Amino acid sequence: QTHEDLYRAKSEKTMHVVQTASGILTFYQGLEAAGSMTREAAQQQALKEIKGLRYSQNDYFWINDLRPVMIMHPTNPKLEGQDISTIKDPDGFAVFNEMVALVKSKGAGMVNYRWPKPGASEPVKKTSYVQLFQPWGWILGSGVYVD
């Protein structure tokens, strides 16, 4: 039983909720591919639904793209439609640029950074799984706060 085993387990949870939520992307992209909705309408409907999803103690999902621009953020909605390339946490970690570089290399993975909790402003340590949804160039993410 290794350190790697313990960390594999804790973060599996995060991975699985993101994979769960990403099925909404899959569903809506299918309707786009079949010609039943336009891409942009399919995108907006998917965002709207993913915006309301929660698990555990008000843990949530966000979406940003590869540019990077924030597409949907349920607790910081004023970041939406903005270039988020210049955002850095208090340790200097370039949150979204790191996420983009990670998914471009590997498709998905874990990343740690500081972010405020919902409805608060102090940046707290957080560990998130991000996953590229390739047809739309979207990164879906969720994480858990150290407390």
Q: What CATH number should be reported for the domain holding residue 125?
A: 3.30.450.20
How far is the CA of 67 from the CAs of 6, 15, 85, 103, 137, in angstroms? 34, 23, 8, 12, 9
What experimental approach yielded this model?
X-ray
CA distance 50 to 8: 25
The DSSP code for 69 is B
Question: What's the structural domain count of the chain?
Answer: 1
Q: What is the resolution of this structure in A?
A: 2.0
CA distance 99 to 89: 13
> Which helix or strand (DSSP H or E) is residue 72 part of?
strand 70-72
For residue 5, what are its two tokens? 């085993």
Q: What is the domain extent for residue 3?
A: 1-147
Residues near 37 by beta carbon (within 8 Å), at least 6 away in sequence: 28, 31, 45
